[PDB]
Each structure stands twice: as structure tokens, then as C-alpha cells.
Amino acid sequence: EYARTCAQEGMVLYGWTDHSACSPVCPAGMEYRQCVSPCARTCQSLHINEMCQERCVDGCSCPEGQLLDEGLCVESTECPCVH
Amino acid sequence: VCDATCSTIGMAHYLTFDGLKYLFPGECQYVLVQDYCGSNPGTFRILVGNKGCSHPSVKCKKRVTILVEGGEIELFDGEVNVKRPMKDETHFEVVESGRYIILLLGKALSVVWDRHLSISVVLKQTYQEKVCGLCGNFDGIQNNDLTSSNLQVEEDPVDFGNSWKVSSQCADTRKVPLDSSPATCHNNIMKQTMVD
Amino acid sequence: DQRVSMPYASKGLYLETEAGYYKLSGEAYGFVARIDGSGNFQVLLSDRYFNKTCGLCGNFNIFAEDDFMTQEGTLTSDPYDF
Numbered sequence: 001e002y003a004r005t006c007a008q009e010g011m012v013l014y015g016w017t018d019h020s021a022c023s024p025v026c027p028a029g030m031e032y033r034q035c036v037s038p039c040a041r042t043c044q045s046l047h048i049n050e051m052c053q054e055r056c057v058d059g060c061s062c063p064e065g066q067l068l069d070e071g072l073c074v075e076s077t078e079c080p081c082v083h
Numbered sequence: 084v085c086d087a088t089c090s091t092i093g094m095a096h097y098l099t100f101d102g103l104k105y106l107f108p109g110e111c112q113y114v115l116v117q118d119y120c121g122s123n124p125g126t127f128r129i130l131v132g133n134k135g136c137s138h139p140s141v142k143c144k145k146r147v148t149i150l151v152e153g154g155e156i157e158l159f160d161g162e163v164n165v166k167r168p169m170k171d172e173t174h175f176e177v178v179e180s181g182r183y184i185i186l187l188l189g190k191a192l193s194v195v196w197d198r199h200l201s202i203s204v205v206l207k208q209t210y211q212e213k214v215c216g217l218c219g220n221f222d223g224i225q226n227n228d229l230t231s232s233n234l235q236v237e238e239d240p241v242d243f244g245n246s247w248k249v250s251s252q253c254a255d256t257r258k259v260p261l262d263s264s265p266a267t268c269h270n271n272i273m274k275q276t277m278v279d
Numbered sequence: 280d281q282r283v284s285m286p287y288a289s290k291g292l293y294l295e296t297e298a299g300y301y302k303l304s305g306e307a308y309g310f311v312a313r314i315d316g317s318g319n320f321q322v323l324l325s326d327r328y329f330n331k332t333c334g335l336c337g338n339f340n341i342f343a344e345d346d347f348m349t350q351e352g353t354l355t356s357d358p359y360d361f
């Protein structure tokens with residue numbers, strides 16, 4: 001709680017969970033980042049930018065690649081199609 | 084060849100350039116028309132966005148964000164707002180004449196807005212299959228205006244516009260059971276004649 | 280009472296998931312709720328409701344103290360009967 005209460009005030013903190021020996025729970029494939037963008041580049045997405053100027057939000061997300069597809073992180077090579 | 088014209092006739096309908104009325108009730112933000120389509124530079128990205136508009140009512144105010152020449156001029160609640168002015172201001176123009184907001188953006192682009200819901204973007208002969216979006220490709224062929232973002236023709240428009248939403252994690256709209264009577268006129272055959 | 284799927288967008292309330300955690304946005308009405316995996320409610324709310332909203336999360340004023348004003352309107356010292 002103390003992490004977020006300082007983040008909301010205009011001063012964010014970084015990497016505090018590295019040594020704290022407690023990470024908040026999240027489903028498989030993802031773990032807790034800090035200040036990830038809400039507009040997560042997912043798989044079935046349209047490559048448009050500079051509309052998501054929203055503020056930065058904490059929460060768990062995928063690795064550097066490994067795009068999202070239906071609540072799991074999957075590698076960008078295996079992006080499906082839909083019909 | 085003449086100058087084509089999209090439209091948004093009412094809350095949830097769309098008339099393509101080549102001429103194809105279809106039904107698409109959505110509540111997310113959708114690409115009405117753009118130019119960054121396949122193998123092109125990508126000059127302009129007119130968008131459209133509705134809120135509480137799956138069922139037409141006194142709700143459903145529209146929001147429109149048009150992105151041309153590195154700009155961001157947008158409009159809702161009657162007035163037009165510039166969030167980021169664009170470089171070549173020479174082509175910009177705004178003609179608040181009458182009930183409409185006519186709005187030029189270049190040699191071959193124009194927008195019209197009745198201050199309430201309608202969006203009638205007008206394009207010139209310049210493009211001729213350089214665009215895509217909910218208004219289609221502007222090629223004359225009238226039965227390929229359902230080419231989704233994943234490059235195939237679909238038959239059901241409610242699966243089409245779901246391909247063109249910006250936020251890929253908002254709610255995709257629901258395949259409604261087809262019928263000649265909408266919700267209020269459903270099993271209210273009296274009222275269905277006073278409206279007809 | 281009818282269980283719906285998710286996402287969901289009726290009546291101007293987009294019920295999404297962000298960063299693996301569930302969100303309920305009401306920007307037309309001025310609030311953003313969410314829950315995490317463990318279960319930790321959060322309510323981001325417009326400055327608008329200053330000298331205004333009153334509930335279990337207190338009035339959006341400045342005074343951290345006075346923000347136990349009961350449903351009658353009574354500054355109570357106890358954080359519990361409030």
C-alpha cells in the first residue's frame with residue numbers, strides 16, 4: 001500500500017520489490033512490473049500510437065516480447081488469426 | 084469519377100464510399116477511415132468513438148479524433164478542440180455555417196458534422212484504393228467494403244467493426260438475433276405502426 | 280442476477296482488465312475502480328467531489344482528520360461505529 005500511496009502523489013518509486021521478498025500475486029506468464037503502460041501491445045491489435053497518452057499504472061504484464069492473447073503471454077511468432 | 088462521402092446515419096449505421104449501408108452497434112472506439120493501410124505512408128487517421136450507443140437513445144454522444152499532419156484536433160459536446168496543432172496550418176479551415184461544422188484538412192479531404200451525431204467525410208479522386216476502415220477502400224467495387232483488418236472479406240458486419248477497434252481489450256459487441264422489430268417495437272405491434 | 284461474461288461495456292461503464300487486474304471505469308460519471316489478484320479494492324475519483332462525497336472512504340476534502348462525518352453528520356472519534 002505504501003508504494004502506491006506515494007505513486008499517486010506524483011513521485012513514483014522503483015524496484016522496491018527486488019529485495020523485499022514479497023511480490024504481489026498474478027497469473028502464469030506475468031509478474032509484477034512497476035509503471036507499465038495500460039495500452040498493452042497485444043497480438044490482435046492495430047498498430048496505432050500517440051493516442052494512449054494516459055498516465056502510467058502499476059501491475060503485472062508480459063515479458064519484452066511474448067504478446068498477450070486471451071489472458072496468457074505467447075510469443076509474437078505464434079500470433080493467430082480470427083474469422 | 085466523383086467525390087465520395089461516408090456517413091453515420093443515426094446512432095448505429097454506416098454508409099461506405101461505394102455505397103453499402105450496414106448495421107454495427109458498438110461502444111468502443113473505432114477506425115472510421117485511414118490511409119495507413121497495408122503498404123502506404125499513413126497520412127491521416129480519422130477515428131470515431133461512441134459511448135453508451137449499442138442501443139440508440141438520448142444517450143450516445145459521439146467523440147471524433149482526427150489525426151492529420153502530426154496533429155490532434157478533436158470534437159465533442161458541440162465544439163471543436165485542438166489538442167495538438169498541426170504543422171502546415173495553411174490547409175486548415177473551419178466553416179461553422181448553419182447547423183454544420185464544415186472542416187477542411189487538405190487538397191483532398193473534408194469533414195462535416197451536424198453537432199449531434201453525423202460524420203460525413205468527403206474524399207476526392209486522389210486516393211482510389213488507398214484507404215480502409217469502416218468506410219471501406221474507395222475503389223468502386225461495392226461488395227468488398229467488408230475487408231477486415233486481417234485482410235479477408237466477412238459476411239457479418241458485427242464481426243467486421245470488431246476488427247477495427249483501437250483498444251484491443253475493450254468489449255466486442257454481441258451478435259444480436261436478427262428480427263424486423265427492435266427492443267421497444269418487439270411485441271408492441273401497435274407502436275410499430277405509428278413509427279412506420 | 281444474470282452472470283455476464285467479461286469484458287462488458289453497458290450504460291457507460293467499461294468493465295475491462297488492465298495489467299492482469301480487473302478494472303471498472305466510469306469516466307462519464309467520474310470514477311475508476313479496480314481489484315487486484317489478492318483482493319484490494321481501489322477507487323480513483325475526480326477532485327470534483329471536493330467538500331462533497333461522504334462514505335466509508337471519507338470526504339474528498341483536505342483535512343485528513345474530520346473525515347468521519349456519519350450519515351447523520353457527526354464528527355466521531357471512533358473509526359468503527361462510523
Ligand SMILES: *[C@@H]1O[C@H](CO)[C@@H](O)[C@H](O)[C@H]1NC(C)=O
Pocket residue numbers: 330
Ligand atoms: C464547504 O462547504 C461549506 C458549506 O457550504 C462551506 O461553509 C465551507 O466553506 C466549504 N469549505 C471548503 C473547504 O470549501
Ligand SMILES: [Ca+2]
Pocket residue numbers: 101219220221222223224225226227228
Ligand atoms: Ca469497395
Ligand SMILES: [Ca+2]
Pocket residue numbers: 337338339340341342343344345346
Ligand atoms: Ca478527509
